[PDB]
Design a protein around this ligand. Structure first.
Ligand SMILES: [Ca+2]
Ligand SMILES: [Fe+3]
Ligand SMILES: [Fe+3]
Ligand SMILES: [Fe+3]
Ligand SMILES: [Fe+3]
Lengths: 125, 125
């Protein structure tokens, strides 16, 4: 595994983020955890691809161009802002608007989001 | 596993952080992954317990009361700041200072740091 990759156990629901890579394969509930590669699920990009907006002191991230649902059974679980050496994670809950604000000093950033139903997506500024 | 918990795979090196909890046991290289519980390792607190300093617009975290080594074989791999529903992670490498700055609007925070040799540690304000 590699740093910052996201893996999920399709059985119990465990989802983890790699902090240190290693050489072992991640396993859970008798099967290899699935690498959740960004922008791979056959879903609408309009509501899943993060939209990044530069603001004073940081960035505002919206999911997505069109507001994604935030219902109990279908919502954005978290939005992250990545830099060359930072990963800021903002968890969300149903009922909230699919957006997050990150105060950070980085010219180049990558925003990611995870939809409980449609998976992992990313975009860069 | 519960959100924010850090697990390590003995022998193979992988270290992951839980983004979504579940009942399944994380496995890697033929053993259950080891929960890296904070402040349980028999090591000097002076160099491992994070020190939190409130600054303008955020917090400055130093590891620790006494500067921790940042050598190729013994260093702080990352520092995190936890608040409400946020987990901000700053990755570090040998040769850098055992310090991290986080711009966040939260009165109550928890700082964490992971030493490649002495494990997981935390502190709160
Ligand atoms: Ca994080
Ligand atoms: Fe392993
Ligand atoms: Fe969706
Ligand atoms: Fe599982
Ligand atoms: Fe140490």
């Amino acid at each position: 595994p590699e740093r910052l990759q996201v893996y999920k156990c399709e059985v119990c629901g465990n989802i983890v983020e790699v902090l240190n890579g290693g050489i072992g394969e991640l396993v859970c509930c008798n099967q290899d955890m699935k690498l959740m590669s960004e922008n791979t699920v056959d879903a609408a990009k309009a509501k899943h691809v993060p939209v990044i907006e530069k603001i004073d002191g940081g960035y505002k991230v919206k999911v997505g161009a069109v507001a994604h649902p935030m219902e109990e059974k279908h919502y954005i679980q978290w939005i992250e802002l990545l830099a060359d050496d930072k990963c800021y994670t903002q968890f969300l809950k149903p009922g909230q608007a699919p957006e997050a604000v990150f105060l950070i000093e980085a010219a180049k950033v990558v925003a990611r989001e995870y939809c409980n139903i449609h998976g992992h997506w990313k975009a860069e500024n």
